Amino acid sequence: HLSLLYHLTAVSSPAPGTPAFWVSGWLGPQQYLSYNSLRGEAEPCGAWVWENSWYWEKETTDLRIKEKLFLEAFKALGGKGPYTLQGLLGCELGPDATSVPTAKFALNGEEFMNFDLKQGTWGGDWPEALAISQRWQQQDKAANKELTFLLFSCPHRLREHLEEWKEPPSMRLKARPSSPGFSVLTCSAFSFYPPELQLRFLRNGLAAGTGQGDFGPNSDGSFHASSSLTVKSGDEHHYCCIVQHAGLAQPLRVEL
Amino acid sequence: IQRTPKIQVYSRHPAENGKSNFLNCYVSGFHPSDIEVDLLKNGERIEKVEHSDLSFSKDWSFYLLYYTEFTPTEKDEYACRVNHVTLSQPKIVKWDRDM
Amino acid sequence: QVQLVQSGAELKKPGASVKLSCKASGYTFTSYGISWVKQATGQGLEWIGEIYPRSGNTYYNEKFKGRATLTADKSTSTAYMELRSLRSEDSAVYFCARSTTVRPPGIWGTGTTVTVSSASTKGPSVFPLAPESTAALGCLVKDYFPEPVTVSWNSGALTSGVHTFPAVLQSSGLYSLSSVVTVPSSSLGTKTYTCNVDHKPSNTKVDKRVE
Amino acid sequence: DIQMTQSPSSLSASVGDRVTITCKASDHINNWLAWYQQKPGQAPRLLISGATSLETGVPSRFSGSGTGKDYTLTISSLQPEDFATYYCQQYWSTPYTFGGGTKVEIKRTVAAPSVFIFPPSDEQLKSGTASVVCLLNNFYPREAKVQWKVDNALQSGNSQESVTEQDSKDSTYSLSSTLTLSKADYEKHKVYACEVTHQGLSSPVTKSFNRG
């Protein structure tokens, strides 16, 4: 839950007017950083726009580096059809007293490469992974900078970003006519925080299973969720919804 | 590779007529990243919209939040209009006032 | 070793009177007040009053007042609470505690239980509870009054899987509880299971093999 | 009398999280407020006095705050030994009054009960009465419904329930339901069942036996 993660994306055939490479920086579930190849500078986000910094130019120097090698990796491929390259870099507060680093890369939607921190180099099994890891390994400093961030800079910043908000959901349980002889119950949870939340249906005090669960963000930093169960008409009042959330003393039962 | 969008439409707060609120369109789980999204009041484009940065979940699929400040009337109808390479024709998701 | 020692459990009939005692040790009794706090089963806490031995000043909660008297014996280093015209609602745990005018009590006695009813002290009947991979046995401890009973299994050697339920008051005005234990069904053959029930008020003990 | 409104009356939480207990007084008590911790079978233990002053030996994860009429006890990182009932108490004016208490309970996964039925003892049948006992073992959460069927006759008003506290290692509950009948009534019917409904189950479990 206390993490520092960077989402990186490069596309070989950007739609005109879109960036070929862009990054979002995350502290827990909130974005603080944003970069893209068209503007070329690390811009703060949210409450981070108000500040004194050395930090935001160190970020712009790094991101320009990543931009050049992410787009350079495409030159190691050689096929035609468009390529999407995604990267996930950062560390977590482990249940330990540790950093648990992450350094995974995906090609056209699935994982194909990683930074091996015991060895200190990029690697993978697909021939595309070997072609790109050696292209990046051919840059001096590049592997050394990647390892420094994951093992030192990143846990350092996570520890100093030490120095818990709660808000329970507004619940609604609404029935709606479905197919012939069926109805749809939908349990909704509006603007809550933190995002961890579970919905369960009960029929006569018995488990009706999960419903079909939806989950989405709000623009203010809160979250929304919903679950829907299809039931038999007339039998709708026999159902209730139980929501669990850190903002509640005890599980909350919602009625129709 | 190609994954088709999930489109969820919901108000930030339980909807009541007269009170100001926010309308969200959350497009998630798609691939590749090129996508176009419109918020539709009674049928055509609302221009005072703003959106999140395009990002991606742990399963590598992309997501995007489109939101606007609005005030629900009894009659006005709001929907979301998404177009993606996986869609024959742009999909429209009405805002159901029950969800 | 600063402590308060309270007198033993009491059983009184409606309309009678009881005098609880609270003996100080490990500190100068006359230097502090003694307060009294009521706690009926399952309920919260109620301040009854306190008394300062040096002045004799007594502070009372008007909800009691008409029926509670606090005194203090500087020679025996002992505070007393007398409750008159006992009703059934007076059944509870009564704590004594060491008070001052500026701080809440940090030193508490361990409580005296008071029961108010017409039922007479009665030892229990002990009946067995007996019927996959796990099997369940138990004892039904029925129709004892003053409360409490203690229940062990195999003289205390068997504690894992034991569940001893809180007693329930029956319409008869007598208590009853059950104690059970789940075991591997393998062991029913060559392993003895005995619950050991002790009801000190009526001075009865029972060991009951369950089969 | 100054009224102490303590909330919540109970809460479920896990080792390591931050729990907040609130106490509101009907009148100004000027920080003459204490917080107590009580575990079953024990006298209340004073943790905090004067709204904010920790008593000696109380770990610094306990903290108190508030002024005027509103007071808060915060446990910053819940530990296994902190699961208990907490009470506030104003000692500003007589009579001193306590809050209604907050039982802090261990949160865990839903777990369905193991059900067992026990017929009355032959030894007991000579009493003139028969007790039929249904045991619900190691379930969570505590809410559960037990219905007794005689032959098939649904009983109501002749049973009594009792629930343990959360188990030492399980954090689960157990429950006993005792059906009390006369010997004559017991020996005039055949099939005794208890039907158990719990949110951990898809459909009610029934355990039965036929006299004989």
CA separation for the pair B94, B78 (Å, rounded)? 6
| Full 3-state SS string of chain A | CCEEEEEEEEECCCCCCCCCEEEEEEECCEEEEEEECCCCCCEECHHHHCCCCHHHHHHHHHHHHHHHHHHHHHHHCCCCCCCEEEEEEEEEECCCCCEEEEEEEEECCEEEEEEECCCCEEECCCHHHHHHHHHHHCCCCHHHHHHHHHHHHHHHHHHHCCCCCCECCEEEEEEEECCCCEEEEEEEEEEEECCCEEEEEEECCEECCCCEEEEEECCCCCEEEEEEEEEECCHHHHEEEEEEECCCCCCEEECC
Distance separating alpha carbons of residues D158 and C180, to the nearest angstrom: 21
Q: Based on the domain organization, do C67 and C149 belong to the same domain?
A: no
Question: Is the previous residue joined to D8 through a cis bond, with omega within 30 degrees of 0?
Answer: yes
Does B93 reach chain A within 8 Å, measured CB to CB? no
DSSP state of D112: P
CA distance D54 to D46: 9
How many residues are present in chain C?
211
CB contact under 8 A, D137 and C105: no
Task: Give D96's contacts (C-beta < 8 A, 6+ positions apart).
Answer: C35, C47, D89, D90
What's the total number of domains in chain C?
2
Residues 6+ apart with CB under 8 A from A125: A112
User: With contact defined as beta carbons under 8 Å apart, do A207 and D202 qualify?
Assistant: yes
CATH number of the domain bearing residue C185: 2.60.40.10
The secondary structure of residue C174, as a DSSP letter, is -
DSSP symbols for D17-40: --EEEEEEESS--TT-EEEEEE-T
Strand order in the sheet with D114-118: D114-118, D129-139, D173-182, D159-163
The alpha-carbon gap from D165 to the nearest alpha carbon of chain C, in Å, equals 9
A212 touches chain B (CB under 8 A): no
Tell me how far CA of residue D114 lies from CA of C132, D143, D195, in angstroms: 11, 14, 12
> Where among C66, C95, C118 does a domain terminate?
C118
**Pairs of residues, one from chain A and one from chain D, whose beta carbons lie less than 8 Å apart:** 35
CATH of range A165-255; options 3.30.930.10, 3.40.50.800, 3.40.30.10, 2.60.40.10: 2.60.40.10
Strand partners, A190: A170
State the amino acid at position B67 in one-letter form: Y
Architecture of domain B1-99: Sandwich (2.60)
Distance (Å) from the C-alpha of residue B42 to the closest C-alpha of chain A? 23
Do B12 and A188 count as a contact with CB atoms less than 8 A apart?
no
Chains near C with 3+ CB pairs less than 8 A apart are: D
**Which residue in D132, D134, D133, D125 sits closest to D187, CA to CA?**
D125
- C90 and C131, same structural domain? no
Structure token pair of residue D78:
């819940």
Retrieve residue A33's tokens.
């950083």
State how far Cα A151 lies from the chain centre.
Answer: 21
> DSSP letter string over B13-66?
S---TTS-EEEEEEEEEEBSS-EEEEEEETTEE-SS-EEPPPEE-TTS-EEEEE
Contacts of C79 (CB under 8 A, 6+ apart): C21, C22, C23, C24, C29, C34, C51, C53, C70, C71, C72, C73, C96
Rg value, chain D, Cα: 23
Which residues of chain C lie closer than 8 angstroms to D116, CB-CB? 131, 136, 180
Counting as contact any 3 or more CB pairs under 8 A, the partners of B are A
Of C35, C106, C140, which is closest to D131 when you measure between CB atoms?
Answer: C140
**C124 shares a domain with C109:** no
For chains C and D, having 3+ Cβ pairs within 8 Å is answered yes
Residue A205 Ramachandran class (φ > 0 left, ψ -120 to 50 alpha, else beta): left
**Structural contact between residues D102 and C48, judged by C-beta atoms closer than 8 angstroms:** no
Cβ of D92 under 8 Å from any chain C Cβ?
no
- Are C127 and D180 within 8 A, CB to CB? no
**Which tokens sit at D14?**
């896990």
Quoted resolution (Å): 2.4
- Contact predicate D124/D183, CB 8 Å: no
Rounded CA separation A29/D117 (Å): 50
Instruction: Please tell me the distance in Å from B36's CA to the nearest CA on chain A.
Output: 11
Rg (CA), chain C: 21
> Tokens standing for D197?
């409904």
Strands A84-93, B21-30: pairing is unpaired
Which residue in this structure is represented by tokens 């705050």? D65
Q: Calculate how close chain C gets to D14, using CA atoms only, in Å.
A: 23
Closest C-alpha among C179, C198, C199 to residue C121 = C199
Any idea which residue has 């007790």 for tokens? Answer: D131
Give yes or no for a contact between C108 and C4, defined as CB atoms under 8 angstroms apart. yes
Distance between CA atoms of A71 and C6, rounded to whole angstroms?
81
Query: Which of A3, A21, A84 is most worth mutating to test chain B (most B CB atoms within 10 A of its CB)?
Result: A84
Residue B5 CA to residue A122 CA, distance in Å, equals: 31
Which residue ranges make up each domain of chain A? 1-164, 165-255
| Tokens at D36, concatenated | 């107590």
CB spacing of D135 vs C109 below 8 angstroms: no
Give the integer Cα–Cα distance in Å for B30 and A14.
Answer: 16
Distance of CA A237 to the CA centre of its chain: 38
Residue B65 CA: distances (Å) to CA of A11, B1, B11: 21, 22, 12
- In chain C, residues with a C-beta closer than 8 Å to the C-beta of D45 are 108
Please name the residues in contact with A21: beta carbons below 8 A apart, sequence gap of 6 or more: A8, A9, A10, A11, A36, A37, A66, A67, A70, A71
The reply to whether residue C180 touches residue D43, judged by beta carbons under 8 angstroms, is no
Residues of B in contact with A22 (CB under 8 A): 53-54
DSSP state of D81: G
Q: Chain D partners of C110 at a C-beta cutoff of 8 Å?
A: 42-43
Instruction: Look up the domain containing C31 and give its range.
Output: 1-118
Would you call B11 an interface residue with chain A, using a CB distance cutoff of 8 Å?
yes
Flag whether A touches C (3+ CB pairs, 8 A cutoff). Answer: no
Backbone dihedral angles phi then psi of residue B14, each to the nearest 5 degrees: -50, 130
Residue C138 sits at the vertex; the CA angle it makes with C190 and D127, to the nearest 5 degrees, is: 115
Spatial separation of the C-alpha atoms in residues D206 and D146, rounded to whole Å: 10
Are C50 and C57 in contact by the 8 Å Cβ rule? The answer is no
User: What are the extents of the domains in chain B?
Assistant: 1-99
Report the distance separating Cα A43 and Cα A56, nearest Å.
8
- Please give the structure tokens belonging to residue A254: 């919602």
The CATH superfamily holding the domain A1-164 is MHC class I-like antigen recognition-like (3.30.500.10)
Query: Which residues partner with C129 through β-bridges?
Result: C138
CA-based nearest distance B76→chain A, Å: 20
User: For residue D203, what are the contacts with CB-CB under 8 A and spacing of at least 6?
Assistant: A206
- Look-up of token digits 């007042």: C65
Tell which of A183, A185, A190 to mutate to test the B interface (max B CBs under 10 Å): A190
First to last CA, chain B: 31
- Does an interface of 3+ CB pairs under 8 Å exist between B and A? yes
SS3 call for C171? coil
Q: For chain D, which domains are there?
A: 1-107 (no CATH), 108-212 (2.60.40.10)
Q: Which chain B residue has the Cα nearest residue A220?
A: B12
Say if residues A111 and A104 touch (Cβ distance below 8 Å): yes
Nearest-CB residue to B12 (from A108, A191, A228):
A191
Is some CB atom of chain C closer than 8 A to the CB atom of D100? yes
Distance CA(D153)–CA(D193), nearest Å, equals 9
Residues contacting residue A114 through CB under 8 Å, at least 6 positions apart = A103, A104, A105, A122, A123, A124
Q: Is A205 on the interface with D (CB under 8 A)?
A: yes
Report CB contact under 8 Å: D133, C138: yes
The answer to whether the Cβ–Cβ distance between D162 and C165 falls below 8 Å is yes
CA distances from D60 to A139, D38, D52, D54 (A): 51, 18, 11, 8
* CA–CA dist D154, C94 (Å, integer): 42
Residue D95 CB partners (closer than 8 Å, separation 6+): C47, C61, C62, C63, D1
Residue D111 has what DSSP assignment?
B
Q: Which residue has the tokens 């970020």?
A: A59
Decide if D178 touches C, using CB distance below 8 A: yes
User: Chains with 3 or more CB pairs closer than 8 angstroms to A?
Assistant: B, D
Report the C-alpha gap between A29 and B63 in whole angstroms: 14
Q: Which technique was used to obtain these atomic coordinates?
A: X-ray
Same domain, C25 and C111: yes
Q: Is A224 at the interface with chain B, CB within 8 A?
A: yes
Distance from CA of D79 to the nearest CA of C (A): 22
Q: How far is D91 from chain C (nearest CA, A)?
A: 7
Residue B41 pairs with which residues in a beta bridge?
B44, B78
**Of A164, A206, A250, which is closest to D18 when you measure between CB atoms?**
A164
The shortest CB-CB distance from A205 to any of D11, D17, D199 is to: D199
Using an 8 Å Cβ cutoff, are D175 and D161 in contact? yes
Side-chain half-sphere CA neighbours of B88 within 13 A = 0
Distance separating alpha carbons of residues D211 and D189, to the nearest angstrom: 8
Q: Is C166 helix (H, G, I), strand (E, B) or coil?
A: coil
Single out the residue of B54, B51, B41, B52 nearest to residue B80, CA to CA.
Answer: B41
- Name residues 49-78 of chain B within 8 A of A (Cβ): 50, 52-56, 58, 60-61, 65, 67
A202 close to D (CB below 8 A): yes
